[PDB]
Amino acid sequence: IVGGYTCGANTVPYQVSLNSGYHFCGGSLINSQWVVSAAHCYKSGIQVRLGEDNINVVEGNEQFISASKSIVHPSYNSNTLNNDIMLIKLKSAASLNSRVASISLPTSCASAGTQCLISGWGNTKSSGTSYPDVLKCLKAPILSDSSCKSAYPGQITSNMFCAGYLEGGKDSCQGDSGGPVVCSGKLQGIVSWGSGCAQKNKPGVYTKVCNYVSWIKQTIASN
Numbered sequence: 001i002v003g004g005y006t007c008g009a010n011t012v013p014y015q016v017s018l019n020s021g022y023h024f025c026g027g028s029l030i031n032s033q034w035v036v037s038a039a040h041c042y043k044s045g046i047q048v049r050l051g052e053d054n055i056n057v058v059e060g061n062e063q064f065i066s067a068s069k070s071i072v073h074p075s076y077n078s079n080t081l082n083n084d085i086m087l088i089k090l091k092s093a094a095s096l097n098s099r100v101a102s103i104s105l106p107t108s109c110a111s112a113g114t115q116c117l118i119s120g121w122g123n124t125k126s127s128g129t130s131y132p133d134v135l136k137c138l139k140a141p142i143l144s145d146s147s148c149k150s151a152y153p154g155q156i157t158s159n160m161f162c163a164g165y166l167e168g169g170k171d172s173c174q175g176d177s178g179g180p181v182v183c184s185g186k187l188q189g190i191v192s193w194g195s196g197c198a199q200k201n202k203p204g205v206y207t208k209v210c211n212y213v214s215w216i217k218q219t220i221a222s223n
């Protein structure tokens with residue numbers, strides 16, 4: 001996250017870290033046994049880390065649970081990033097409380113102008129690299145589809161939205177991928193892609209979760 005603030009320990013209780021020996025992506029806990037992330041975060045051998053603030057220090061609220069199954073969306077296209085969404089089933093159910101909690105799926109899509117919370121452990125610089133150990137947060141609005149398509153001609157599908165600031169300076173970045181965009185207490189987006197981070201006229205692009213609720217519910221019900 002570039003241009004954000006330190007969230008505070010366990011203030012984003014649905015935020016997960018995906019770990020394969022090191023943090024490589026975020027995700028969101030949607031019930032006691034399932035995490036949603038980006039398809040471009042797929043790899044084998046994922047451990048899901050819940051209850052994290054500092055990802056390099058054991059602070060006492062962590063739960064580390066291995067993945068038993070990963071399901072990339074059937075229509076994911078790695079070249080265009082269309083349908084950039086993946087479900088991960090945990091080997092055992094997480095223990096839910098105030099510091100580890102699920103986030104609700106949306107019943108309707110959010111409109112442009114809605115303010116959302118984006119969070120992650122990704123790079124905090126737009127030029128150069130500095131990775132934080134504690135969770136960073138950013139409040140950002142959903143942008144109109146016309147502004148999003150004007151920023152990224154020929155690249156925005158109906159399964160994507162832009163959020164952030166056309167003036168630059170505040171954005172998600174490398175290592176935030178797969179993490180949550182939460183608006184009015186519902187998961188509306190997944191950190192997906194962008195051209196660089198926090199550049200002028202290049203806001204972040206996010207997977208539009210409301211288009212996937214039927215697929216998520218049907219998949220969880222049968223796996």
Ligand SMILES: [Ca+2]
Nearest residue numbers: 054057058059
């Ligand atoms: Ca920790």
